[PDB]
Design a protein around this ligand. Structure first.
Ligand SMILES: [Zn+2]
Ligand SMILES: [Zn+2]
Length: 78
């Protein structure tokens, strides 16, 4: 007993290679790209606009992380 998933307004889907995940904006010389080492998705400099390590992922070194992650990475201590 399972179910599928989809939307009501989506005539395309290929945001997995060189396009933001929270914007789908095709990365370019003006749009920086970064694959979140926490989730594994590519976001734009305007999406995450942050940078830090991911202790939750056994990462002590500072890497690219989405805002959703960064916010939790800073409040991880408290
Ligand atoms: Zn974005
Ligand atoms: Zn993330």
């Amino acid at each position: 007993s399972n179910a599928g998933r989809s939307a009501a307004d989506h005539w395309v889907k290929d945001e997995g290679g060189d396009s933001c995940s929270g914007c789908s904006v095709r990365f370019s010389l003006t749009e920086r790209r970064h694959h979140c080492r926490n989730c594994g998705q590519l976001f734009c400099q305007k999406c995450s606009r942050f940078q830090s390590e991911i202790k939750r992922l056994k990462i002590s070194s500072p890497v690219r992380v989405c805002q959703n992650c960064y916010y939790n990475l800073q409040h991880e201590r408290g």
